[PDB]
Amino acid sequence: QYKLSVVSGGKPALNNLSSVTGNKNIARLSQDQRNYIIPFNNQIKVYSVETRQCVKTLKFANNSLLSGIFESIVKILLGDITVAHLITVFTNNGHVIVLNYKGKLVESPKHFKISLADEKLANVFHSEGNYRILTTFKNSLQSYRLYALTFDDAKKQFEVAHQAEWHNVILSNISSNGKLLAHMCKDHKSISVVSLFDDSVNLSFPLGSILSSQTQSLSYNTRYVSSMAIDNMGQQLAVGFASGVISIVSLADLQIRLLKWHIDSVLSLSFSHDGSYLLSGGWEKVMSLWQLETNSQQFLPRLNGIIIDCQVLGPQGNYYSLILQMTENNSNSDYQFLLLNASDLTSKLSINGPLPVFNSTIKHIQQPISAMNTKNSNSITSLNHSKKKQSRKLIKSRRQDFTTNVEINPINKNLYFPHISAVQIFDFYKNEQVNYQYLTSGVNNSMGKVRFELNLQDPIITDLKFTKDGQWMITYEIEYPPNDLLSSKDLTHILKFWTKNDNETNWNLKTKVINPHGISVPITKILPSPRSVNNSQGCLTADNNGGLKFWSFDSHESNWCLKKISLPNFNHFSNSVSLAWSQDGSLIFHGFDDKLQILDFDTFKKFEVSEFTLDSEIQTVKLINDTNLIVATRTTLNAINLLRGQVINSFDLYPFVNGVYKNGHMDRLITCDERTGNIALVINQQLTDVPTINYKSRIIIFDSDLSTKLGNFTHHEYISWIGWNYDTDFIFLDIESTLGVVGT
Amino acid sequence: PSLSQPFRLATLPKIASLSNFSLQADYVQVADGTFNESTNNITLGISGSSISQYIINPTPKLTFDYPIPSTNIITACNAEKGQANKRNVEIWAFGLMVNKGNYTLNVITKALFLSQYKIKAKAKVMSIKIDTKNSLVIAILQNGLIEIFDFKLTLLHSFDISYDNLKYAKWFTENGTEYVFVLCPLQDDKVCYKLLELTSSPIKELSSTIIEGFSFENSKLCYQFGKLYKLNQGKIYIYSLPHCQLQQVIEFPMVDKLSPGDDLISFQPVSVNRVLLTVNNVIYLLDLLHCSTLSQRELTHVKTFQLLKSAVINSEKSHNSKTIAIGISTKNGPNPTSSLEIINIDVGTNTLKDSLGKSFQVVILKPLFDDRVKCNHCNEVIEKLSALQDNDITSFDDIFFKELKIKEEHYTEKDRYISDPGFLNKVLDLIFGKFSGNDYPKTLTFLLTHPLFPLSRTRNLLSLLRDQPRLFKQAIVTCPNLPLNELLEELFSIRNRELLLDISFRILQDFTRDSIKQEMKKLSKLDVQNFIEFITSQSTQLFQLLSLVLDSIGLFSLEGALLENLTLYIDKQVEIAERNTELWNLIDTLPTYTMEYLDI
Amino acid sequence: STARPRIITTTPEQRYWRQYTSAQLVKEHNSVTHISFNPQHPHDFAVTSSTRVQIFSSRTRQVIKTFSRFKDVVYSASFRSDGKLLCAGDATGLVSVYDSYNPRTILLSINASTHPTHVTKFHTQDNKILATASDDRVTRLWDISNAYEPQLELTGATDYVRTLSFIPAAPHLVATGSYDGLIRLYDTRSSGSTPIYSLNHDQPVENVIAVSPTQIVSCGGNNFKVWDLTSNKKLYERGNFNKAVTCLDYVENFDSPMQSALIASSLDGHVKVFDPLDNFQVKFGWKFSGPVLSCAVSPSTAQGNRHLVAGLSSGLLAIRTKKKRMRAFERNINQFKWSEALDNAFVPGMAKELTLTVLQELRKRGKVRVALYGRDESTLEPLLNWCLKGIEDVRSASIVADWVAVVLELYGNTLESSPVLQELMIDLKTKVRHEIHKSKEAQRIEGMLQLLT
RNA sequence: UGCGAAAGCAGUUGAAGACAAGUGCUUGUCGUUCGUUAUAAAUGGCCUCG
């Protein structure tokens, strides 16, 4: 009956090698410069630049070869080396795949395999028919080999020949022409630049020579290099430092030239084709065009994310390609690729996947380097310790929630992600972003936070929901006071009501409630009211103190007003509360800690058995239908008939759910349809011979009363969230930022 | 929802046809036009007696009577008010039966007798509808003939349904148009259902179907809001118009026990998805949508009660939840007397609120999966524990902990399988009988910590554990759902300081401020007075509790001499607390000429 | 790139009435007795004062027509429904009819009685009939065509009749209220001269107004009571007024959030708005220098600026009419000029609320110690001076505490060599101690409140 | 760092290797490792299109 199928895409693919910089971007703009090719983690998309829409899509799932092979793409080359819309994909393992865009995928691409002996392919580049491949071989520093690659027609094989070798490569960069390589080694350090296809350029010099003396007296941040860039002619080499100073060196005489605007570690440096301009980007959220004849500077500030990478992409420098990070989400690394028209510095093409904010970090996500160790950044020393700590947390520790709140729009079926201080509106039908709206105050885009400002925490959207009608948006926010202050421990809780017309795309804020339920009391649960009561313009808000507030929208005030309140001043605090409302709207089920209460809406008080004691704290209380109520406690789940008041079925969740998740996440893991039945989702660690980072997920369809299992399906990765679309199908989000669907 | 006491409208005459109680309802007819929510009048045809119109409120009274010969049987009767050629008039149409030899259709017009007309009908007049707008009288006959006459009984139209022995016909109006559906038995439990629309022919056949498995002889039929309800062998079959397709079946257990032949069953619709079912002298108001018994009432003073008609509320459109129903009550005694009785019925709001816990329908942990991943017999044990000798603590504890593989003396999350209430309650019962006095097994300590400790044994539980301080202490801290009254009386009775503190925290934690105040008023003035003295001699919760006492005492009951002292005590505690605050916040926190001596 | 978010700095019925901000006070020569509004655009309103009647332009809010032919005190200026006529009463008892906006012509002059005629009202439904009430205690109903004899002469009043009302949808019904405390209803279709029935107010009736076709509101003595003729009894009664209520006016179907409004003079200087939909409950009011004798508002179809008019015994007339770049601190913060932005906060003649925002912004910005690093006693006092006053306010109380601590933790040694700053702390000690002291009762009082409940 | 409520309740912050400086010894460091649940500071601030 039911079946599972992936629907949306995932995060854009990046060259995630620590040593490689200036070349993290793998995407390529067509020779005709009419469309852009972007490889994703699970797909390859082709977007026509002129219309800024995805003209073509190529899924590895569709192609058997790509499905088996996909390992990540290390590079794309336009055309076919072996041989007008052909491309060659090089992956890290060494598979070379000749694929076609602008057409239909061929189920038998010219798959090949370059032979490497314990080498991880890092880069490939060409000038005119000649191809060299860079590979990684193994002090915590990886060494590199430069090989010559050619295709022999007789054997139809890619033969590899050795050119050069370098050891303990710290940092590396390739010229815009793709013909010069500059790198750093510890043989403290020395920088060497070499021509790739010729022997014309071969130079080396210690870092000490360019390195100044005052910085030598100063901390390591001043001596720490964060980025490097080499001019096409090789006459100029730019080195950026963690302190935020940029230094240009003339290779002919090693003369030094200081350009200092960035206050934090400069992350991306790139020379222009002629060499007269230098592009810089860093934590300031601002791209700087340094005019080198005069050291003037122009600014394109205000960008969404800090600049991981920056390049000039065009025969005449018509466009700039930039990589943005969105460090605010510490759980995941949120990459956004921007192509700007150099003429007017306007967004020619913005590309990103879904941007969920998980509760904790996942896999090997590490914060970018900064001048000091903060919540949103890692210091120079902090990187290794943080990586080890992350791995050992994923292995030894047992709390592995990695759960994200997601919301679905009844009127438009658009997917809402509560990003930190903002909401992403993402269309999974088209697999493209439709909007990004900032819904809170704070230093959110006013500037780029730098140094201690980076320790600031912007307001966090905790709970986001829609009314059943869908024209209203209820949002709950927590504002964190600044540290080192008397009022540094008094968190502020805010509630906001927003509206928009169907044609209009931006929500307009209609009312604001400051400190609902009192001061320092969080809004742990929110439930929109059913259609029967107040034709879907009411809502319920529930605390950890068991207090309930029913709000409705009054036409006379034109605003949202507190119709009913019940504030039993309980002294025990618990974040485990669940709320359900009957479809008729007569009654409300409120599970607080271990006890469930049936409260009559008219009196807004206990029914006149109203009290149901359970073994342990309730995580979720839900009614699949009016007759049956499904209640999940931390140890089990139980189906009760309200009609007879007895349990039908009981299922033990302890072996899987003991302390893996914080209370309240079962709400977003457990989903129900209003017609057919509900679903239970369980994620487990796969371990062979100590736990391993990779996970496995199981989704089970249950009928109303949980008598039978309609279906049982397995996914290969942590399904962060699952919810019921208003159609019979259910949508599920995976930590690969992948939205699949289970449905009839 | 509720059912009132019936009140008498009239006493039925002692006629032989009415002597058979089981068929008595058949011999009494209720006019549909005059009986509704808003009408205060009922027109009733009592076979062999008369057709009589009564007013109900303020007091039942007979307003009109038309006598009928004793040998005549009323098969169909209707009364409707209208305008006739214009004068405001009341039209009464009734069919009478003489020995099956001749069949009489009669129409009477009265001024609000203006006229009386009588004709011979071909077959049994079963349903009569009066159309005051068009001045028409429509009579359905058992031979399948639907005949439309004027008020003068001049035959205007005749339609044949092509089926004889018609057994059920009901009129209804939808969207302003008149409709009638007719049921005709066929052989082998088959039934012809025909739905007809009243508008060259004024009668248009909309639907004709054959239903199988539909018996009549033991089947009770009623209609409401497009739904046909059939009670048969304790099962209510709900069919939906216009195709009369079986939509649902409800099993009604309380009728399944009835022996076939002795129990007198009557049945009507009273609102949307709500019916009234009378079994002998018992009356039930039932919600069919939610399968709940909204109300029940037993008429001890009558042998039987049979429904005749009920004024049906369209609760979806009506704010009124109040209506009436009429029936025949037969008394107990050697000379039973039958009377007409009316019952006032509150149907309710038609919400799920009404139906909870009123169902008329009467565990083991199941694995999630049937079959390389990290992991984070009740009766037998009851018998083993019961077989043990009296006052053997060691054997009891050994058997319990070993058989249930329990590792800790207190409840842990690992012990979920044990949480079945039935097993626990028996173990509690055994411990009480097995052990008495000053020695109890450790099994109780485990049971006290159990979240599903039965509510039934909560009462007097603290009283039982008074002798052991530890068991008493364990109950307060963890044992669930302790009654508040026992906690309060025990709070003011204990002199031990530590238990007083724990009890107050447990009381304040598990009970709202409003709830605790009311009980605490019941407490004697002396005990509270004693309690206040102890405070004179975590503490914030106790002080908060003291503040709660003062209000329950009330400004009047408070006596000046004591209040001065307590005023002194709190004042000393004020400066102690204020002094503490300052300490806490505290812990958080070149000359022109200089003379100096150098050192050499 | 994105534009910069700009720094972000009662009942609906009350807010509507607050919009009558423009207040003009005019002086008349005697007590202003009666105020009328022309039913027709520009809806010019008439005032009866001394021996003259003055017509005021709605837009100009100034006299446009002055009617001085009246010899003795004038007692009315009511317009007909068309507004082309206006009728008036005089102490001599003669009732005069003039063409509105044409003072000169006396179109109809009738001598109702030798006694004063205080009330003269055109019948709303029927134009030709004009009703006159006099101190003779007979309310003659006159006709324009018949100037020599009344069409009907209503009697039965044993005291002065000073109130005459015509019930909408019931042209035949005529309501009269005398100083007997009795409100008498008459039918003109019948022979008349005898009330259909009498309603007892128990106090002298100063004005009777028909709010709606079935509801009539009578304001007499210290209270006004609404009566329904179908029930023949008072539905509702409000006595919030302290002086005797004198005049009462009603408007409906006007653009306010409230559908209908009822304005009642008190004679204690108060005119208050009552809403019929909520049982005639008090929603708004205004105060004046002296007793209010007359009150009026622009009719529903004003088609222009709405007007509220109040009449005082002193002769005073009050008219209340409802007419139908980025700052320096914002630049400093956008330019990251932390210290200067704080300086802008403490400048003379700066709104307190705005001063809070910039302080809030800097705190939210994580720029607090930075804004205070480069400061001395000379430039620190302005912050302290604000802190000394801000501490009193609840909203600023948390903020001042935050700022004061940082400067305190940041300028300890400086405070030692600066005597002036020390005294600022000393008075700061006293005020916070008072603020403590004020708060201390608040916890006492709130607990006290808890006892009763 | 664990748990919990937000308040808080408990528990941590070790060892080896290499380099630099000062005088084999002392101190400080680590784009080194093993193990435990485990101040900053290179004068350096955000474009233009009315």
How far is B117 from chain A, CA to nearest CA, in Å? 53
Q: With contact defined as beta carbons under 8 Å apart, do A739 and A415 qualify? A: yes
DSSP H or E segment with residue A710: strand A709-715
Q: Which of the nucleotides in strand D have any atom less than 7 Å away from a protein CB atom? A: 1-7, 29-34, 36-38, 40-48
Residue at A299: amino acid letter: F
Q: With contact defined as beta carbons under 8 Å apart, do C185 and C229 qualify? A: yes
Most A-contacting residue of C364, C372, C373 (CB-CB within 10 A), to test interface: C364
Specify the pairing of strand B136-141 against strand B125-131: antiparallel
DSSP states of A534-594 as a string? GGG-EEEEE-TTS-EEEEEEETTTTEEEEEEEE----S---S-EEEEE-TTSSEEEEEETT
Nearest to A441 among C8, C336, C368 (CB): C8
Contacts of B267 (CB under 8 A, 6+ apart): B220, B222, B229, B231, B275, B276, B277, B278, B307
Question: What is the Cα–Cα distance from B416 to A653, expressed in whole angstroms?
Answer: 10
Residue at C235: amino acid letter: L
Residue B283: DSSP 8-state: E
CB A140 within 7 Å, strand D: yes
How far in angstroms lies nucleotide D44's C1' from the CA of residue C373?
Answer: 19
Proportion of chain A in helix, strand, coil states, percent, rounded to 5: 5, 45, 50
**Crossing angle for the helix pair C419-452 and C377-390, to the nearest 10 degrees:** 20
Q: Where are the alpha helices (DSSP H) in A4-56?
A: none
Q: With contact defined as beta carbons under 8 Å apart, do B51 and B94 qualify? A: yes
DSSP H or E segment with residue B501: helix B497-510
How far is A11 from chain B, CA to nearest CA, in Å? 28
Looking at the DSSP assignment, which residues form a beta bridge with residue A611?
Answer: A597
Handedness of CA A202, A204, A210, A211 (dihedral sign): positive
Closest protein CA to C1' of nucleotide D19, residue: A188
Whole-angstrom CA distances from A238 to A106, A203, A258 are: 44, 15, 10
Which tokens is A338 given? 């921007």
Q: Least CA distance to B544: which residue of chain A?
A: A571
Nucleotide nearest to A300 (CA to C1'): D47
Nearest to B373 among A582, A659, A687 (CB): A687
Chain A window 7-36: residues with CB closer than 7 Å to nucleic chain D are none
Which tokens is A173 given? 């960069």
CA nearest neighbour of A325 among A339, A303, A340, A308: A308
For residue A413, report the phi and psi dihedrals to the nearest 5 degrees.
Answer: 60, 20
Long-range contacts formed by A25-30: CB under 8 A, 24+ apart: A25/A309, A25/A311, A25/A321, A25/A323, A25/A337, A26/A73, A26/A74, A26/A75, A26/A76, A27/A76, A27/A321, A27/A337, A28/A76, A28/A77, A28/A78, A28/A87, A29/A313, A29/A314, A29/A319, A29/A321, A29/A339, A30/A78
Chain A window 181-210: residues with CB closer than 7 Å to nucleic chain D are 184, 186, 189
Question: What is the Cα–Cα distance from C100 to C93, expressed in whole angstroms?
Answer: 21
Residue at A157: amino acid letter: Q
Interchain contact C2–A (C-beta under 8 A) = yes
Looking at the DSSP assignment, which residues form a beta bridge with residue C164?
Answer: C176
CA nearest neighbour of C162 among C244, C105, C39, C282: C244
Specify the pairing of strand B227-232 against strand B235-240: antiparallel
For residue B325, report the phi and psi dihedrals to the nearest 5 degrees.
Answer: -140, 150
- Which chains have 3+ CB pairs within 8 A of B? A, C
Separation of CA B522 from chain center: 34
Whole-angstrom CA distances from B223 to A293, B273, B274, C307 are: 96, 11, 11, 64
Residue at C192: amino acid letter: G
- Which chains have 3+ CB pairs within 8 A of A? B, C
Whole-angstrom CA distances from C310 to A652, B540, C271, C318 are: 78, 59, 8, 5
Method: cryo-EM
Q: With contact defined as beta carbons under 8 Å apart, do B13 and B49 qualify? A: yes
CB A392 within 7 Å, strand D: yes
Whole-angstrom CA distances from B552 to A82, A513, A570, B69 are: 94, 36, 19, 75
How far in angstroms lies nucleotide D30's C1' from the CA of residue A291?
Answer: 37
Question: What is the Cα–Cα distance from A359 to B489, expressed in whole angstroms?
Answer: 48
CB A341 within 7 Å, strand D: no
Q: How many CB atoms within 10 Å of residue B508?
A: 20
Q: Which residues of B314-336 are buried (b: 16+ CB within 10 A; e: fewer)?
A: ebeebeebebbbbbbbbeeeeee
Specify the pairing of strand B190-198 against strand B203-212: antiparallel
Torsion region of B271: left, alpha or beta (phi above 0 gives left; psi -120 to 50 gives alpha): beta
SS (H, E, C) A656-673: CCCCCCCCCHHHHHCEEC
Handedness of CA B250, B251, B255, B258 (dihedral sign): positive
DSSP H or E segment with residue B198: strand B190-198
How far is C294 from chain A, CA to nearest CA, in Å? 32
CB A544 within 7 Å, strand D: yes
DSSP H or E segment with residue A166: strand A157-174
CB A256 within 7 Å, strand D: no
Q: Least CA distance to B589: which residue of chain C?
A: C409
Contacts of A579 (CB under 8 A, 6+ apart): A525, A527, A540, A542, A548, A588, A589, A590, A591, A621
Most B-contacting residue of A608, A610, A615, A712 (CB-CB within 10 A), to test interface: A615
How far in angstroms lies nucleotide D50's C1' from the CA of residue A33?
Answer: 35
Handedness of CA A281, A284, A285, A286 (dihedral sign): negative
Question: What is the Cα–Cα distance from A197 to A128, expressed in whole angstroms?
Answer: 10
Q: Do C450 and B551 touch (CB under 8 A)?
A: yes
Question: What is the Cα–Cα distance from C424 to C223, expressed in whole angstroms?
Answer: 57
Question: What is the Cα–Cα distance from C56 to C63, expressed in whole angstroms?
Answer: 4
Planar angle of CA B341, B346, B352, nearest 5 degrees? 145
Q: Where are the alpha helices (DSSP H) in B120-257?
A: 253-256
Q: With contact defined as beta carbons under 8 Å apart, do A566 and A605 qualify? A: yes
Q: How many CB atoms within 10 Å of residue C97?
A: 21
Interchain contact A435–C (C-beta under 8 A) = no
B352 neighbourhood in chain A, CB within 8 Å = 582, 584, 586-587, 626, 642
Give all strands of the β-sheet with C85-88 in edge-to-edge order: C85-88, C94-99, C102-111
Q: How many CB atoms within 10 Å of residue B423?
A: 17
Q: Which residues of A597-615 are buried (b: 16+ CB within 10 A; e: fewer)?
A: bbbebeebeebeeeebebb
Q: Least CA distance to B544: which residue of chain C?
A: C447
- CB < 8 Å from A in window 36-65 of B: none
Please report where in the chains the tokens 């084709």 appear, as a residue.
Answer: A273
B351 neighbourhood in chain A, CB within 8 Å = 584, 586
Question: What is the Cα–Cα distance from A133 to A151, expressed in whole angstroms?
Answer: 13
Resolution value, angstrom units: 4.2
Please report where in the chains the tokens 């009670």 appear, as a residue.
Answer: B231
Looking at the DSSP assignment, which residues form a beta bridge with residue C176?
Answer: C164, C184
CB A138 within 7 Å, strand D: no
**Crossing angle for the helix pair C394-410 and C352-364, to the nearest 10 degrees:** 50
Question: What is the Cα–Cα distance from A417 to A425, expressed in whole angstroms?
Answer: 7
CA nearest neighbour of A406 among A446, A460, A355: A355
**Cis preceding linkage at A410, omega within 30:** no
B551 neighbourhood in chain C, CB within 8 Å = 450-451
Q: How many CB atoms within 10 Å of residue A522?
A: 18
For residue B305, report the phi and psi dihedrals to the nearest 5 degrees.
Answer: -135, 130
DSSP H or E segment with residue A133: strand A131-137
Question: What is the Cα–Cα distance from B280 to B304, expressed in whole angstroms?
Answer: 4
Please report where in the chains the tokens 């829409």 appear, as a residue.
Answer: A53
Question: What is the Cα–Cα distance from B290 to B355, expressed in whole angstroms?
Answer: 7
Chain A window 266-325: residues with CB closer than 7 Å to nucleic chain D are 284-286, 298-302
CA nearest neighbour of A539 among A497, A575, A506, A509: A497
C450 neighbourhood in chain B, CB within 8 Å = 551
Interchain contact A272–C (C-beta under 8 A) = no
How far in angstroms lies nucleotide D47's C1' from the CA of residue A300?
Answer: 6
Question: What is the Cα–Cα distance from A98 to A88, expressed in whole angstroms?
Answer: 5
Q: Do A615 and B356 touch (CB under 8 A)?
A: no
How far is A303 from chain C, CA to nearest CA, in Å? 5
Q: With contact defined as beta carbons under 8 Å apart, do A239 and A216 qualify? A: no
How far in angstroms lies nucleotide D37's C1' from the CA of residue A393?
Answer: 9
How far is A181 from chain B, CA to nearest CA, in Å? 46
Q: How many residues does chain C have?
A: 453
Q: How far apart are the first and last CA of chain C?
A: 58
Q: With contact defined as beta carbons under 8 Å apart, do A90 and A112 qualify? A: no
Contacts of B229 (CB under 8 A, 6+ apart): B221, B222, B223, B236, B237, B238, B239, B267, B269, B275, B288
Mapped onto helix, strand or coil, the DSSP state of residue B108 is strand
Q: Least CA distance to C405: which residue of chain B?
A: B589
Residue at A675: amino acid letter: R
Nucleotide nearest to A261 (CA to C1'): D44
A303 neighbourhood in chain C, CB within 8 Å = 1
Which tokens is A713 given? 């399906």
Which tokens is C439 given? 């708060």
Please report where in the chains the tokens 């079986």 appear, as a residue.
Answer: B246
* Alpha carbons within 13 A on the beta-carbon side of A152: 9
CA nearest neighbour of A123 among A77, A85, A167: A77
Question: What is the Cα–Cα distance from A429 to A409, expressed in whole angstroms?
Answer: 13
Question: What is the Cα–Cα distance from A301 to B214, expressed in whole angstroms?
Answer: 81
CB C336 within 7 Å, strand D: yes
Q: With contact defined as beta carbons under 8 Å apart, do C178 and C153 qualify? A: no
SS (H, E, C) A135-163: EEECCCCEEEEEEEEEEECCCCEEEEEEE
SS (H, E, C) chain C: CCCCCCCCCCCHHHHHHHCCCEEEEEECCCCEEEEEECCCCCCCEEEEECCEEEEECCCCCCEEEEECCCCCCECCCCECCCCCEEEECECCCEEEEEECCEEEEEEEEEECCCCCCCEEEECCCCCCEEEEECCCCCEEEEECCCCCCCCEEECCCCCCEEEEEEECCEEEEEEEEECCCEEEEEECCCCCCCCCEEEECCCCEEEEECCCCCEEEEEECCEEEEEECCCCEEEEEECCCCCCCCCEEEEECCCCCCCEEEEEECCCCEEEEEEHHHCCEEEEEEECCCCEEEEEECCCCCCCCEEEEEEECCCEEEEEEECCCCCHHHHHHHCCCHHHHHHHHCCCCCCHHHHHHHHHHHHHCCCCHHHHHCCCHHHHHHHHHHHHHHCCCHHHHHHHHHHHHHHHHHCHHHHHHCHHHHHHHHHHHHHHHHHHHHHHHHHHHHHHHHHHC
Looking at the DSSP assignment, which residues form a beta bridge with residue A287?
Answer: A281, A300
CA nearest neighbour of A317 among A342, A287, A290: A342
CA nearest neighbour of A480 among A448, A439, A443: A443
Residue A20: DSSP 8-state: B
C5 neighbourhood in chain A, CB within 8 Å = 438, 444-446
Q: With contact defined as beta carbons under 8 Å apart, do A240 and A260 qualify? A: no
Question: What is the Cα–Cα distance from C390 to A292, expressed in whole angstroms?
Answer: 52
Please report where in the chains the tokens 């403490």 appear, as a residue.
Answer: C346
Question: What is the Cα–Cα distance from C143 to C128, expressed in whole angstroms?
Answer: 6
Whole-angstrom CA distances from A637 to A405, A641, A712, C303, C413 are: 21, 14, 17, 67, 65
Which tokens is A133 given? 């491949």
